[PDB]
């Protein structure tokens, strides 16, 4: 249950928080990147697809599977205006 999210960075950013990463497990056993908060009115909220508990697979060209929090944050912030997110939905 992989879905694609194409978004446009608003002024306040992409409008979501992440947790997770190798050395920073969000779920015991899981090194994956996870969305923990969708900020009201932000890019992500207005698009409506992204959801808390979503796992980030890729952002643009940068795969996010088995990486450090800080690598994920860096890649998520190295983004232009146009953002492609590849996500997996829970369970």
């Amino acid at each position: 249950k992989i879905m694609e999210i194409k978004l446009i960075k608003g002024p306040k950013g992409l409008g979501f928080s992440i947790a997770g990463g190798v050395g920073n497990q969000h779920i015991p056993g899981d090194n994956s990147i996870y969305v923990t908060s969708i900020v009201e009115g932000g890019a992500a909220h207005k698009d409506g697809k992204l959801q808390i508990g979503d796992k980030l697979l890729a952002v643009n060209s940068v795969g996010l599977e088995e990486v450090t929090h800080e690598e994920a944050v860096t890649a998520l912030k190295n983004t232009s205006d146009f953002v492609y997110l590849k996500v997996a939905k829970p369970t």
Binding site: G13, L14, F16, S17, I18, A19, H69
Partner: peptide
């Protein structure tokens, strides 16, 4: 929990 990074906000971006």
């Amino acid at each position: 929990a990074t906000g971006l």
